[PDB]
Structure 1
């Protein structure tokens, strides 16, 4: 870009290259010409997103490319028929129109459910401009970050967001928040010297998104907008392309299963149809008729609404998904790669442990205050609490009485803010407590003095004397403390107490944490009266000999839900891996703190620490956990990495760049892993895009991370995720309940026609009617099967093996078509011939009859009783054979939906009335079937007539045949789940 040299440059060389000055900045005339030259200092969004071509992609896919092929074959068939002059060629134009109408209205449904998904994301995003304090023509003032141009001179301070990529020139104790780019939760020191040649490790550059915590600095802009470090991570994260979702894989799997049957059924019944001696035009037009019945015109609809009800279920729990496929993905997901800083943690310095009264107390670290706080009963605390509260200069922004204290904005340092929040919660109205002990002398934290300190007058007026409070680097608090508060009294700081403060300081340093000492001293109102004048440079007060209060320590803590959430996913068969750009010590801590690394497991560097060997001679397998730092990961040929990954089951990756994050997911996806990543900052966006489902904190998340992610958690409730797996496995189980239902009936939609081809009986079932099944009668049942519950304890299973456990397969496929569809076919043919014989046509006569039946030029054909019917009366019986094959299906299909409720358990055991949505659906199924027959004019409008209430009941002894074949199937598969019968008769 332009930067890999910039930090190594001299001020003479820099202000030459960008034609500026390190003191005065740009001339306004030139900073305007550069803004035109380089555009605005922001990030071009993924510029190409036309509204119409969003709808375009809502129309391709597994099922849709099938319907199109079928829709085309409906038009190829229609022309073929009218070319040799065929009548009611409507029925080819009705299926083509319905096939295309279904794929269209599905494309609309999702289009809004993205618009509304992406407007609710646009709702949660902040749109007030970030700001820079700039210098131009030697004038300091405020502007917006976006008008910064390459070469400008700016300033920063505690609170201001870093407005560009900036080179440091002078730094006064400047610390910064890098957790968006690096995983570094620790603040980072900024200084104008060249620490490195890679500008991500050097200290003399500030990055475009980062947050300045405490201190102040000044420097020059070196790259603006996309050309920043920030901007070039989305450029890769845009360059990343994401994989096809697991559910879409399982769709195009069975699309190819469906096609395979249509083809052979067309070909065989074309080769069959040629041996009945047809026209080649017609042995093959049936071929096309055959393949098109095998398309369920309405399965695409039932899936999209099944997903919507789970998509909506999640949305109610503050969990937004962009496209409905990812709704499933969590359930089938088997690996979670998780960002630490900002994702597993709160990314907030919180007070964790304290030392006083010779005891290491641990506080409540959580955001909602659900945890377990410490003993505040003793005197040493109230003094220690007074010290930390009074020796604190940070301040809350006004009007924050509502928001929980952890989520409030404080004008102050990193350490000072954490204590202020801690002081505010533990004591209550911290700001007002220290106001009533009026401050009269103060010393800033210092390079030469190395501590903070203040002296105060006291609360009640009957005490006229003063008190001094001091905190700082604990060893610099101890050299000047000769007295310690202990158990009420104030004791001498002897060699018991000297060696006991150094063990604790380095004990809490052992947890990586940042810790300060706190101390106090009461001054005499004789030497130091009301009206005394304290001077600093003349040390007219004690800078030594103080009474020690205690230590207080801070750390980046996990989010309250996270540790529970982590260990519920592990118990659901999902390995977790931390992928964090923080240093390996904080990594292992949070890893054990939440349950990435379990209580009682070790890295190889703990075995060689316990056994005290060199690490050289330790066994790898015996270490349950391992930590790999980002730069030793380079040395690893991936096949080394695969040895390590399945050998150390609890893995932790430290100091990993956005590139390595992507790699680790890629290395897992290469091993048949459905893996999801979770992140906040831009370091996650690449791996957030590569993942099978990327998840982004809707609050703590950077824009590129949320853009690249497929799912967003707006409440930042990490435990929203586990509710996702339960869903993703629910619909998965519940889809192969819903899908198996809508597929069975295609066979008794085809067999009446297949028999019609080869036996030439009067047409049993019409494409005017087979659509009313496909697209009206059987929809409410199929989508109710979303509301099936677990049968097992769904959350206590492994994720689905992608290869063995599929959405449909040869066992589930053959059972639904060729066994259940056969019974529904026999159920129709029986109800067919009854209507025939009972209205006049003997089944034996129905053989080969069709030629004269549909013949328009006969008007007096003799039935078996010798009665002569006109064509327009044979019509109304071929309509009755429609209506009678139709009700045969409905009485059979009402049995089909109940028996998919339960895939292993007996519907006795689970229940009949179980799914109250599934019950309400079926009343809808018979009610439209009643309207379709006995409404006035229904004979002519569609091909249905008021049928006699005898033919209703003829299929009912086939309906209840079905219930007791699958019952003794899932009674025999639960009672005898052995080898033979558990594979064949199970789906």
Structure 2
């Protein structure tokens, strides 16, 4: 009945929050401030279990082995192996002293899969192995007060209906309700993507359970301030755990790569059955025994199966992944590497994924002008001019007004990436000085405070007053930082270029105008004013008041405004544009407030400047929102509240008729629905997330991605891709590789396939015309799995033919990995030439030892007999069984060689799909090496001592090597002119068939 359990998990969260203080007690029967009794606690711990999420079921290592031993491509090979033995069994009884060739094929076939499997599992292990190396997380002790005895207990030991003091810097133990508060704010970013900390209040605020400040959430922490409260949901009952449980119990979906294999498999067998069935027909028409005929069908179908291709594909896939791992892009699953290239549409999260989840100084206003501080994580951004003294008179206020400082432990850690206590807003201010205006540590002590003012709920303002060490004017100085509206009331003078100036109304409008603009931007706005406190009218020494207000509140000297927001990552904007360039759809999904979101997409390229949201049109005309038609707005914003009352059909409409699109105030569940809605189009969609809110989407995504450090661990596991460096630009690199590997696989696939036509061909005519067998089964193995592999692997290293980034996303129902076209080029034409050359060589040898082609017809029968030893040739000599067999073996060996010679050209032509040989050039060093590896190997295979004994492969007379040279050269000629013919002809029939 789990489909219901899943469905209940899919539903948006429901909870009860609004009620009398007394009523919470009337439900859970715990004294509001007295805590509880131990006996009460013990009963519940059995009732619901401990306060921890249930671990995801461990998967035994041995089980995985079988997965790669089965899969899809591996399964195809197996039946072959099996069908060797089933064939061999039939063969064993019927034949007398049967040849052991078929049996050998089967063992090797199974071994290849077992190796391939073993190799694969080594890598997929190594990821989750090293993935555990950064999964070194730590338990955190719970802070608990029971029966008023203030007894802290272990987090697992936590139980329902209990009291808790959430002091600053302590992680929230479990989802709880609030009874008392002193401005504690919490990071709900992980659960609901709130970039700004939201203050916590006991009173009810909003219907949505997530929004109301009365409740609390797991995997969050009280940053500043303190509060207390009482338990509601614990352990699995916790919203996050439910969310995780949901994610882990979902369907990873079929990855696009392996699906192309499954279609690829269909075509392979599809020609095989037709070829085999046709041959079986012809074989019976040829009068050979039924039992023998079956063997023939099996042999053709079996030998038609690719052998080493499985290994070539696997090795090629791994290599591409390695470079990603070189640049801290790790994939737990090997198959997913290609997914990035295949993606037609993306959905990313705002905070933690694009944002650094740190409040940070954004813009500054001094001397009636704006100065956007460099928002860069790595400090690569441009900087404002600091020449004006107003910067100094401004910077000092921040450095001193701020309450705290950096932790001592941080040493060579970069200024931006170092932890600090207290409000983040204060931190960013401490930061901005530390980069731009020297240091603060000395600067903080160099001006000695006397009295400071902490945050006050009533009459809110925040100020201090320190001494002036600079000898010019010993009079003490007072600094006040506050919200602009309150600050406006308390200041008259303004410092421009070091001269105090009064509050002209026009300047007052400008400050108000600036405040409005920054608010639209969404950065929190803070204003700073400082006025020198004279020493003639007020004693230079001890003259202070704390209860009755002494110092001049009003008529201070204002300096400027500083704005704070969570910027994107340094490389994020450029990457977004690059993706858009490939025609990929870019969409932002977050649970954050619309105000912050809209600007982000404008600044990062999701929203092109000048495109209008449905609302902007209303504002442009001062008209009700309803009137304008939605089509006019190329982009659209969608608040989460509306989404709840929305039907799958409407989404479809919302998607197609727009491009730039952003949702906000969205539940994690709601995110998942978006992905499915994108999927319902039948397109390939990817997902990037930071917090637990993103865990469900990544899983159900074709491929999920997250950040290595700034990410939530639950989501980390669900994703198929982990970015260790947290370099968003890596995604751009990924798509590049994905499109790149795709094409090179097309190339690789063709090389090994073309080989099968000459591989199989002799076996065929051998039955049809009863001639001596032109090619040994063993020798085939030396091609499929011996010489050819090293080129097949080398092909993957091929560089880009053209700027793939320009290319639009392929369509999965259109440009499939292996079309009918490819078969025609390799199996249909090149292969036939590839094979033809071998037969020519075969005929040459036999003739050169007096066995004339015309005379070789029907010769098989007497040939393979082990007792007739006076076999006559056209020249008329008589031959013993072993000799003429040695010749056949020594005739098999050139066939193997010629195959390499002929394959040489294929390696070259399949290096390019469109460009001329030298248009791309032979720059692939590995390709080159293989040429020699393949050659040297082949040569050795024939000239080592006793190869004709161990492998029945004899040395080669020197002329034979150049036998097929015209043929190979001809193959080169045909393909080059063909690829160069489609260069000139953009849309010619040439393209529709030959191009693959």
Q: What TM-score do you get using the length of structure 2 for normalisation? A: 0.96
Q: Which runs of structure 2 are paired with 1:525-924 in the superposition (5 Å)?
A: 525-912=535-922, 914-924=923-933
Question: Match for 1:114 among 124, 129, 132?
Answer: 124
Deviation (angstroms), 1:340: 1.1
1: CA distance between counterparts of 2:192 and 2:92? 69
2: CA distance between counterparts of 1:408 and 1:868? 92
Deviation (angstroms), 1:820: 1.3
Change (3 A) 1:561 1:131: farther
Deviations 1:645-671 (A, max 9, x none): 122211111112112211221112221
Deviations 1:13-63 (A, max 9, x none): 545655644434354566566556544433233213011111121122231
Deviation (angstroms), 1:862: 2.1
Q: Which residue of structure 2 lines up, in the alignment, with residue 977 of structure 1?
A: 986
2: CA distance between counterparts of 1:4 and 1:825? 70
2: CA distance between counterparts of 1:679 and 1:16? 41
1: CA distance between counterparts of 2:799 and 2:568? 32
2: CA distance between counterparts of 1:479 and 1:133? 42
**SS of structure 2 residue aligned to 1:93:** helix
**SS of structure 2 residue aligned to 1:521:** strand
Question: Match for 1:406 among 401, 416, 420?
Answer: 416
2: CA distance between counterparts of 1:425 and 1:696? 29
Do residues 930 (structure 1) and 965 (structure 2) align? no
2: CA distance between counterparts of 1:700 and 1:687? 17
2: CA distance between counterparts of 1:198 and 1:580? 16
Change (3 A) 1:945 1:20: farther
Do residues 191 (structure 1) and 201 (structure 2) align? yes
CA contact (8 A) 2:68 2:74 kept: no
Question: Match for 2:287 among 277, 289, 297?
Answer: 277
1: CA distance between counterparts of 2:49 and 2:126? 31
Q: Which residue of structure 2 lines up, in the alignment, with residue 949 of structure 1?
A: 958
Q: Which residue of structure 1 lines up, in the alignment, with residue 180 of structure 2?
A: 170
Question: Match for 1:247 among 253, 257, 262?
Answer: 257
1: CA distance between counterparts of 2:46 and 2:951? 67
Do residues 342 (structure 1) and 321 (structure 2) align? no
Q: Which residue of structure 2 lines up, in the alignment, with residue 289 of structure 1?
A: 299
Q: Which residue of structure 2 lines up, in the alignment, with residue 318 of structure 1?
A: 328
Q: Which runs of structure 2 are paired with 1:370-519 in the superposition (5 Å)?
A: 370-460=380-470, 463-519=473-529
Change (3 A) 1:340 1:379: same
CA contact (8 A) 2:34 2:147 kept: yes
Deviations 1:834-868 (A, max 9, x none): 12112232222321111222112223322333333
Deviation (angstroms), 1:253: 1.1
Deviations 1:363-416 (A, max 9, x none): 111100111222222122211111111100122112323222221110111321
Deviations 1:896-921 (A, max 9, x none): 11111111011032213x11111011
**SS of structure 1 residue aligned to 2:961:** coil
Do residues 218 (structure 1) and 228 (structure 2) align? yes
Change (3 A) 1:868 1:24: farther
Deviations 1:112-160 (A, max 9, x none): 2122111222222342223432223423355543332223322223322
2: CA distance between counterparts of 1:460 and 1:126? 50
**SS of structure 1 residue aligned to 2:875:** coil
2: CA distance between counterparts of 1:504 and 1:786? 57
Moved more, 373-382 or 450-459: 373-382
Q: Which residue of structure 1 lines up, in the alignment, with residue 62 of structure 2?
A: 52
Change (3 A) 1:532 1:897: same
**SS of structure 2 residue aligned to 1:132:** coil
2: CA distance between counterparts of 1:653 and 1:169? 33
Q: Which residue of structure 2 lines up, in the alignment, with residue 263 of structure 1?
A: 273
Do residues 962 (structure 1) and 971 (structure 2) align? yes
1: CA distance between counterparts of 2:769 and 2:871? 19
**SS of structure 1 residue aligned to 2:862:** helix
Deviation (angstroms), 1:889: 0.7
1: CA distance between counterparts of 2:626 and 2:788? 67
Change (3 A) 1:115 1:33: farther
2: CA distance between counterparts of 1:46 and 1:262? 44
Moved more, 4-13 or 599-608: 4-13
2: CA distance between counterparts of 1:352 and 1:465? 33
**SS of structure 2 residue aligned to 1:663:** helix
2: CA distance between counterparts of 1:449 and 1:612? 37
Q: Which residue of structure 2 lines up, in the alignment, with residue 238 of structure 1?
A: 248
1: CA distance between counterparts of 2:661 and 2:339? 23
Change (3 A) 1:32 1:636: closer
**Root-mean-square deviation (Å):** 2.0
Moved more, 8-17 or 836-845: 8-17
Unpaired segments ≥5 residues, structure 2: 1-7
1: CA distance between counterparts of 2:388 and 2:151? 51
Do residues 182 (structure 1) and 200 (structure 2) align? no
2: CA distance between counterparts of 1:96 and 1:140? 73
Q: What TM-score do you get using the length of structure 1 for normalisation? A: 0.97
Unpaired segments ≥5 residues, structure 1: none
Q: Which residue of structure 1 lines up, in the alignment, with residue 4 of structure 2?
A: none
2: CA distance between counterparts of 1:678 and 1:259? 38
Change (3 A) 1:692 1:538: same
